[PDB]
Amino acid sequence: MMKLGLVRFSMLLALALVVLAIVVQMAVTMVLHGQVESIDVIRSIFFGLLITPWAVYFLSVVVEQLEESRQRLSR
Numbered sequence: 001m002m003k004l005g006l007v008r009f010s011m012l013l014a015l016a017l018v019v020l021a022i023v024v025q026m027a028v029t030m031v032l033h034g035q036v037e038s039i040d041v042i043r044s045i046f047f048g049l050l051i052t053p054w055a056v057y058f059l060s061v062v063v064e065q066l067e068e069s070r071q072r073l074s075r
Contacts, residue, residue, distance in 0.1 A: 005067035
């Protein structure tokens with residue numbers, strides 16, 4: 001029931017989280033000068049598996065993200 005933007009092609013604020021996350025990841029990656037392969041990615045396709053935890057954590061964030069209609073239902 002509880003929703004905000006995740007209803008019909010919405011949720012703009014989320015983009016800021018994506019961009020921010022990307023920037024943060026870039027900074028962290030730069031700071032953590034650890035030569036291995038690619039921030040523990042082990043092949044591009046492998047990233048797909050990361051979509052599981054990412055989607056879960058992200059969905060939760062999106063669920064809490066007070067976008068369009070104030071909701072905030074995460075703990």
